[PDB]
């Protein structure tokens, strides 16, 4: 539902758009800062995630 | 005008010391000389001289400001012995080395020239 | 003249707070002229220094920890590179990517050719310089920068 | 002894790849004999000659002051212990950033490639014996050339 609102939003269907709060280089930094093993399972319920 | 008397640039004021000397907290035996009223001349000179010493772990120095006589040396030696002789031993060690280059040149001009004087 | 003044100025207009500006939302300033210039040459991958030369530009340097990082070759004789130093300046931990966009490399479909680093991406990471040049891209006022990270 | 992560005798297949070449820095393409890793690799030819036709030694390892750990950094020039991998020739110090296959497939994680960062002289490694040392992690990783054998 978001996606087809979000359509509506930019008919020209451009991707780059003004936003506060980087959550890439947020995440990117979770990843860094934690040490975070790409290749190792990881530790966490989706659920929690969606809460 | 603001221009200060050219002389100032190198005779010690009334108030001020020729070198002090302070202790560095971020990492330990390490010190920090400031040498009022001197220049590269002199600093660049007393840098190649410690590093020349292997107990020497870190040496530099920089120059704060260029309008500003003065330059700092930071100097950092292994726990087993003192930065501070490593200092006084360089300028000796110095002072040996241009007293020899001295000798040698008075001597070599003694060697058969003429118009030497 | 007064306190109330002295107060609002150093609190309110103060050049370290403006930094970015909210007239385009990237910062008002990078670095400028002759040492942009002299960056560019020195962050290149063959840029390399003895002892000394890196003890004297430790020496001025202002955060430093005081810890001599390790030169990237130590055989046959001790040499550190120019990224490498560069790390030191890089604040705790700012960490960038891309912003390589120069005439250097390639106009996009080159780089994807496998990641023969080309050698022109400019990828930081936990503060420490990994690798390739920087420019206007990265150091300048350009809204992706470096300088924008770290504020 | 530092804890082996990698070794090989290796030889190299070229010099310039694309040519396109430059100073103090030059980028090899090699082949290990095994015939089952591949490496690309910067290294300083100003001081380190390397020829086309040279079959070198190459190894990989975690530490040198033996086994113990090194991360204190600080390079320390008044260290003396033997422990050293200092018999090679030659020796870098550096960081991983990358590595990287694919994973994607029914068990997959088959074959494999390490990107390795040495102050900006970078290396790529593809292999799958390296699987247990390969890990994107801070400044610790040590690449020592030696010899340029025979
Ligand atoms: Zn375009």
């Known amino acids: 539902e978001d996606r087809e609102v979000l359509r509506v939003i930019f008919p020209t269907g451009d991707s780059k758009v003004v936003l506060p709060c980087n959550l890439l280089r947020m995440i990117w930094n979770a990843q860094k800062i934690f040490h975070i093993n790409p290749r190792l399972p990881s530790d966490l319920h989706p659920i929690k995630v969606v809460e | 005008m603001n221009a200060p008397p050219a002389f100032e640039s190198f005779l010690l004021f009334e108030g001020e010391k020729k070198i002090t000397i302070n202790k560095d907290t971020k990492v330990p035996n390490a010190c920090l000389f400031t040498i009022n009223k001197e220049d590269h001349t002199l600093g660049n000179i007393i840098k190649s001289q410690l590093l020349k010493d292997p107990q020497v772990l870190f040496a530099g120095y920089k120059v704060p400001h260029p309008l500003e006589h003065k330059i700092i040396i930071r100097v950092q030696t292994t726990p087993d012995y003192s930065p501070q002789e490593a200092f006084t031993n360089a300028i000796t060690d110095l002072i040996s080395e241009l007293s020899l280059l001295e000798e040698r040149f008075r001597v070599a001009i003694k060697d058969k020239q003429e118009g030497i004087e | ?151 | 002894m530092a804890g082996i992560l990698f070794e090989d005798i290796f030889d190299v297949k070229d010099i310039d790849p694309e040519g396109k070449k430059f100073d103090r820095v030059s980028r090899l393409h090699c082949e290990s004999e095994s015939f089952k890793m591949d490496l690309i690799l910067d290294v300083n030819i100003q001081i380190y000659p390397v020829d086309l036709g040279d079959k070198f030694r190459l190894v990989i390892a975690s530490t040198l002051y033996e086994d113990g750990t090194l991360d204190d950094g600080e390079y320390n020039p008044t260290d003396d212990r033997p422990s050293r991998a200092d018999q090679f020739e030659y020796v870098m110090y550096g960081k991983v950033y990358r590595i990287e296959g694919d994973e994607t497939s029914t068990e997959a994680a088959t074959r494999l490639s390490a990107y390795v960062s040495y102050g900006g002289l970078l290396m790529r490694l593809q292999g799958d014996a390296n699987n247990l040392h390969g890990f994107e992690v801070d400044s610790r990783v040590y690449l020592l050339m030696k010899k340029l054998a025979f």
């Open chain 3, 1 to 151: 003249q007064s306190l109330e003044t002295r107060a609002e100025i150093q609190e309110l207009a103060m050049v370290p707070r403006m930094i970015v500006t909210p007239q385009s939302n990237r910062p008002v300033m990078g670095i400028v002229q002759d040492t942009l210039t002299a960056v560019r040459k020195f962050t290149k991958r063959d840029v390399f220094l003895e002892r000394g030369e890196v003890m004297n530009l430790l020496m001025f340097l202002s955060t430093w920890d005081g810890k001599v990082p390790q030169p990237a070759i130590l055989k046959p004789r001790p040499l550190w590179t120019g990224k490498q130093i560069f790390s030191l300046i890089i604040p705790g931990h700012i960490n960038c990517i891309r912003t390589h966009s120069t005439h250097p490399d390639d106009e996009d479909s080159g780089p994807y050719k496998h990641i023969s680093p080309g050698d022109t991406k400019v990828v930081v990471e936990n503060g420490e310089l990994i690798m390739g040049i920087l420019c206007k891209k990265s150091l300048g006022t350009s809204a992706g920068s470096l300088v924008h990270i770290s504020y």
